[PDB]
Design a protein around this ligand. Structure first.
Ligand SMILES: [Ca+2]
Ligand SMILES: [Ca+2]
Ligand SMILES: [Cl-]
Ligand SMILES: [Cl-]
Ligand code: NA
Ligand code: NA
Length: 275
């Protein structure tokens, strides 16, 4: 299972890829980027630095979110995407073309990966870079602390979707500047579940599946995990639209869980309990 190999690859690295995370943040800062309208700014960077022309287009083959034309250096980006997802696509291609050697060197540190897993890892690392470019580490970490980890306000502040914020929160393991350690859980209506752990090594799946009963509303609960500790969980369905990295082909629920001992920093931790 290639996806299982890549899950271990990120697990072994605490879900944080330092060289790519730092490369994204340095490129964001050195190019004078500012949060807001990053899709236009990235298009300028792509032209200036690589001679790649970004164009917004419809009728992309297979309703893809992007199509790169390497022979004339044109990146087509789907018109139905919101600015945050347009930026995400462009930054993903920026990693593939401008961080290719770095990505290859990172993948190579896992001696066991199969070929299929190396290809999955390459795309995952380019996606990782895109998240770390749209949400540069120190700025995003500072914003998460000052907004008390409010996923919706973070999304509105940076112009990105709910699962994009959640995934980034689950990567904040930079040494000496960690965020709250989260378990990230994504599931579809049929129970197909992707779980990512930062601190643990393990499950009450209703902590995220419960979101499907109150669509587009945050669902919060406290549940014990297999270690005997209680976790505070926040979950929501993702709208099938132009924002967030999850495909609009079906509906997902996404959630974060943190040790109850970290939950006081969450805006979510005030409220009344019931069965
Ligand atoms: Ca391992
Ligand atoms: Ca969405
Ligand atoms: Cl992709
Ligand atoms: Cl997004
Ligand atoms: Na290194
Ligand atoms: Na870990």
């Amino acid at each position: 299972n290639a996806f299982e190999e890549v899950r271990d690859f990120f697990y072994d690295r605490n879900n944080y890829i330092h060289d790519l995370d730092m490369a994204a943040e340095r490129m964001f800062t050195e190019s004078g980027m500012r949060t807001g309208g990053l899709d236009i700014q990235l298009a300028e960077l792509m032209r200036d630095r690589f001679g790649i022309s970004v164009v917004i287009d419809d009728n992309l083959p297979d309703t893809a979110k992007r199509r790169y034309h390497p022979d004339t250096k044109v990146l087509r980006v789907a018109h139905w995407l919101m600015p945050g997802q347009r930026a995400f696509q462009i930054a993903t291609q920026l990693a593939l073309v401008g961080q290719s050697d770095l990505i290859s060197s990172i993948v190579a540190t896992d001696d066991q990966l199969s070929t299929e897993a190396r290809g999955v890892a390459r795309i995952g690392l380019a996606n990782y870079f895109a998240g770390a470019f749209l949400l540069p580490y120190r700025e995003f970490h500072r914003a998460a602390e000052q907004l008390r980890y409010d996923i919706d306000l973070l999304g509105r502040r940076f112009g990105v979707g709910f699962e994009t914020v959640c995934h980034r929160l689950s990567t904040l393991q930079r040494p000496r500047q960690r965020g709250i350690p989260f378990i990230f859980v994504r599931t579809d209506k049929a129970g197909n579940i992707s779980k990512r752990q930062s601190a643990t090594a393990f499950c009450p799946l209703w902590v995220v599946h419960d979101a499907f009963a109150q669509p587009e509303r945050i669902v919060r609960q406290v549940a014990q995990m297999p270690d005997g500790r209680s976790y505070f969980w926040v979950a929501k369905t993702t709208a099938a639209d132009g924002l967030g990295y999850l495909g609009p082909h079906k509906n997902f629920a996404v959630g974060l869980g943190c040790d109850l001992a970290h939950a006081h920093k969450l805006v979510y931790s005030t409220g009344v309990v019931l069965d």
